[PDB]
Point group: D2
């Protein structure tokens, strides 16, 4: 059967949970228009993250791959337009790496556009009453690193397969710490991802 692969990260150091993981956990094993969703959690570590990712794309041979990360501070669900060939880290990752301006993949192209039907996804979300928008930057931390890796790997190995990235905001419990920071409940998050993934599946363009 057809498989949609959805990924997320383990907690980043400080946090005790990763919301992105928590949000997709309810999707495990569910069916959408004749494809079953597989999930898989990857470490929040440069390069080691791509290894885990590649293994997952390899094992599951998915028709659609969607990675999810957390973008603390953003007000809404954001669907990434583009991944950039650059690691540049404000803080270190889970294994203590803090690369400065080094390529995700050496001699790889400057960027890859997501192949997902991004405007339709954002449109679907807005219509469902969920705030959502297209983003032009996935950042330069692990989230963008994984998005670039994904899109490159699909382009080298299985070019018909569509890949992309979705960032969720802070959970309310996390915004309590930060203080004046936007959040979204776990429940709404899980619903937003579900709507986005169905919409990604139905369409293409």
């Amino acid at each position: 059967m057809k498989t949609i692969l959805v990924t997320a990260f383990d907690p980043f150091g400080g946090e005790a949970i990763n919301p992105s993981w928590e949000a997709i956990k309810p999707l495990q094993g569910s069916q959408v228009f004749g494809a079953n969703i597989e999930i898989c959690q990857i470490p929040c570590i440069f390069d080691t993250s791509l290894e885990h990712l590649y293994a997952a794309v390899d094992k599951y041979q998915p028709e659609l791959v969607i990675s999810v990360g957390q973008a603390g501070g953003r007000t809404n669900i954001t669907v990434e337009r583009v991944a950039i060939n650059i690691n540049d880290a404000r803080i270190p990752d889970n294994a203590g790496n803090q690369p400065i301006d080094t390529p995700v993949i050496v001699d790889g192209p400057a960027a890859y556009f997501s192949r997902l039907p991004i405007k339709t996804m954002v449109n679907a979300l807005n219509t469902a009453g969920i705030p959502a928008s297209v983003s032009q930057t996935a950042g330069t931390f692990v989230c963008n690193h994984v998005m670039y890796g994904l899109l490159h790997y699909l382009a080298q190995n299985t070019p018909s397969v569509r890949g992309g990235f979705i960032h969720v905001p802070y959970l309310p419990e996390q915004a309590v710490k930060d203080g004046n920071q936007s959040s979204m409940t776990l429940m709404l998050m899980t619903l937003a991802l579900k709507i986005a993934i169905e919409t990604a599946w139905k369409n293409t363009s």
Copy 2:
């Protein structure tokens, strides 16, 4: 014993007002020894106060908490102070757009809320709900109603504590604006429950 909790009908534009939606589920529920009553008031200057005064008079509450919506805010906010000024960016549902007039002529400049605001904000934070104390309720209808409330309690029944909570946008309303913070109806309702129970308990 009675806890009166109020909200507004929608600001002309919107089809609903989140604040009314959020406290509907609270009606009838028992809090320690007290029962919650709700009552919706029109979102327009001076008439709002009349409906309010009516409700306080009918229910004779031990504790009155008014709720309104503060589009743009990221979290539940509990108000510190109400100010004796109407100054309106837009008109209310009835076309009034007062500029720099008193809420109540010869009334004091301001009233402090009587609620245990910090404790409430703590209960909410502990529960994993973003919340903070605010020093401005605005100068539109919400502040109008807040100042009016506290002045009426101060005149007619000084032992009764009053105050104000602002809720952010619902998610559906933040689609419209675009890049604006929101909070689901469910979470509001839970936050208000915790907030009210805390005020009563203290």
Copy 3:
């Protein structure tokens, strides 16, 4: 005929206070037959009111305007109301961190500024300077002082109008604080001058 303008000495961290830097050029300057007198006051609860009360007695001014810094704000803000509360998130220059205490016991809950605030915001906006009326002066030393000021004038010299103005970060200040709005000293001085002239003009007959 004297206009007293006050500002603070730098708050512990900072090496200067912009509100002070901004009003220095105004010392001795004429405005419609009045003289500007400036005075720096300590950023400490209670001691500040002492300096302030001293300066008012000394200079016997017909108009008093106090200036402070509101890191974060984008523009010039003219305060509408002073609140009778001290609530300190961090301590003052002398280690005091009062939590929910009167500025003045048994004083009224608040004081409205007696200054012509809309006309001041308008004179600023018309001269191309971003400005707006503010409904809160915070609950640190700046509001503490605004409140004491209005109280003191009300009690001793009731025809004398008082009010508070907040300036934003200087650009050098915003460098550290990363993503923060600033305004140059030059613009700040210019704004304060226009604000003060406008105040003096609409405090006549």
Copy 4:
């Protein structure tokens, strides 16, 4: 030996364009034995590229920095990457509003700026000017021009480095837009002069 520096004409609504106003004083100013040439280009898709390509052909520059307005940003921003997409919220000066079309058909997805972006941000910060690297130059005419610039340079004169700097609103402009960050004209001109000196030296 010429540094070409470009800016846009006022955008439809606006009466001036801060990007142009801030580079005017730089005309013919010398920096380390190079001379600065400025040129204003239209805020129209494609037509802008034709002007740009012509200025590069005429002036034969060793360095090319394009400047633009990013209303709302708090500081000077130095762009890191240009994106091969036109996606316009509103139309350009000539009524064009492309939705999701390539800037240049069959071009690579992006170009990195060849400027020393971190060094420029550091010199600015060191000099007390707020500034930072940006990962998106938007998808309107500014990004359009950046991409065209870097692509043109790469196909015709690959030795020559190119890049983009965004400036915030002038205070004049933030008066309208209300609660908006600004930076005075003088501080912009200063910032731009330090960035270009730094870019040339490295």
